[PDB]
Scaffold this active site. Structure first.
Site, short mmCIF file in Angstrom:
data_model
loop_
_atom_site.label_atom_id
_atom_site.label_comp_id
_atom_site.label_asym_id
_atom_site.label_seq_id
_atom_site.Cartn_x
_atom_site.Cartn_y
_atom_site.Cartn_z
N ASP A 1 0.83 -1.34 0.04
CA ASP A 1 -0.20 -0.01 -0.08
C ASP A 1 0.87 1.24 -0.03
O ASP A 1 0.55 2.27 0.82
CB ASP A 1 -1.03 0.23 1.09
CG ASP A 1 -2.11 1.06 0.94
OD1 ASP A 1 -2.42 1.26 -0.19
OD2 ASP A 1 -2.76 1.49 1.96
N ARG B 1 -0.96 8.95 1.12
CA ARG B 1 -1.64 8.76 2.55
C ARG B 1 -0.75 8.13 3.50
O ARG B 1 -0.76 8.42 4.76
CB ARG B 1 -3.07 8.22 2.42
CG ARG B 1 -2.95 6.72 2.11
CD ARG B 1 -4.38 5.98 2.07
NE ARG B 1 -4.09 4.69 1.38
CZ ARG B 1 -4.37 4.63 0.08
NH1 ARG B 1 -4.23 5.57 -0.57
NH2 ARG B 1 -4.30 3.39 -0.47
N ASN B 2 0.22 7.22 2.98
CA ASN B 2 1.00 6.44 3.94
C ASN B 2 2.37 6.80 4.29
O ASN B 2 3.28 6.42 4.87
CB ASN B 2 1.15 5.02 3.39
CG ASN B 2 -0.26 4.21 3.91
OD1 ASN B 2 -0.48 4.38 5.03
ND2 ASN B 2 -0.69 3.11 2.97
N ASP C 1 2.61 3.04 7.59
CA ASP C 1 1.48 2.36 6.90
C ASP C 1 0.36 2.71 7.86
O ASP C 1 0.54 2.31 9.25
CB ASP C 1 1.62 0.79 6.74
CG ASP C 1 0.70 0.02 6.21
OD1 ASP C 1 -0.25 0.65 5.63
OD2 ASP C 1 0.73 -1.19 5.99
#
Ligand SMILES: COc1cc2nccc(Oc3ccc4oc(Nc5ccc(Cl)cc5)nc4c3)c2cc1OC
Length: 273
Positions: free
Chosen positions: A134, A138-139, A155
């Site tokens: 991912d 945003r991470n 994460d």
């Protein structure tokens, strides 16, 4: 990785200052005064939730790299259980890109450095055979908002982040080191668009159909060609044809040496649209 490796911080030494993320995330303090981010495990949870929490602490703690968020300790002998991470004062990259968009602030070289930082973190994960699954704006996290900032990796069916996944991932459930290369491509796009949502007006199913049939995002506004070329190389249909992270890092670094890339102005948004 043994629990022995986890540094247990006695609960009395830990103070929660404010919430950060809607488990939950808080800014906290550790007295021997250290500035930390805290991840909590909910008191009401599965036996498998307990295993996951421990496992995340074990995995994060074994990583030693300048562009991966460090686990500074744990507090697993009191309820609710804490994993302690270094506080990244700059916040998440997506918010940062959005809040710092030029208005009538950031230059190309700043975006390229974030890209290099994350590519450098991804190379280290690939070298240690860890699949993140991912990689997304945003991470990613920043140490501070100023010119000396460093970005690090963190994460936090219709649930899958389809817009960040390669075809073999969402069609076939296959994950490998080349999964994160695709996702890195989409991250690059998020960075150079200054925080837009990928596939601007498409839904998940529309993206799936679009991508499975060879469709690819257009370059972000004013995005230099060599940067777009890295993106389109990360989005090669077959895993084998995608570059590994040593090649990506090299290409980002060469972009950073090109005056025609680094002198390019970022777009400026006109409020009244
Ligand atoms: C200033 O604002 C923040 C600072 C932060 N500083 C440090 C950590 C933050 O969020 C987390 C919370 C829990 C996390 O768990 C992980 N785990 C992780 C990290 C790296 C890898 Cl490669 C895999 C898992 N990263 C996290 C990052 C932060 C979140 C923030 O706002 C949401």
């Amino acid at each position: 990785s043994s629990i022995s490796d986890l540094k247990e911080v006695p609960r009395k030494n830990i103070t929660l200052i404010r919430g950060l993320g809607h488990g939950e995330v808080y800014e906290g303090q550790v007295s021997g005064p250290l500035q930390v981010a805290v991840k909590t495990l909910p008191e009401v949870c599965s036996e498998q939730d307990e295993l996951d929490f421990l496992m995340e602490a074990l995995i994060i703690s074994k990583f030693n790299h300048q562009n991966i968020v460090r686990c500074i300790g744990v507090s697993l002998q009191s309820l609710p259980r804490f994993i302690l991470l270094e506080l990244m004062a700059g916040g998440d990259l997506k918010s940062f890109l959005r809040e710092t968009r030029p208005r009538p602030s950031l230059a190309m070289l700043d975006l390229l450095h974030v890209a290099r930082d994350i590519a450098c973190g991804c190379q280290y994960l690939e070298e240690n055979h860890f699949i993140h699954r991912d990689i997304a704006a945003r991470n990613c996290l920043l140490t501070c908002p100023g010119p000396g900032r460093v970005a690090k990796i963190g994460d936090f069916c219709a649930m899958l982040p389809v817009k960040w996944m390669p075809p073999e991932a969402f069609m076939e459930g296959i994950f490998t080191s080349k999964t994160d290369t695709w996702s890195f491509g989409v991250l690059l796009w998020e960075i150079f668009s200054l925080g837009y949502m990928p596939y601007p007006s498409k839904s998940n199913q529309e993206v799936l159909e679009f991508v499975t049939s060879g469709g690819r995002m257009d370059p972000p506004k004013n995005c230099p060609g060599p940067v777009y070329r890295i993106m389109t190389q990360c989005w090669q249909h077959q895993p084998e044809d995608r570059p590994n992270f040593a090649i990506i890092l090299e290409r980002i670094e060469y972009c950073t040496q090109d005056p025609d890339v680094i002198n390019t102005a970022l777009p400026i948004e006109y409020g009244p649209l």
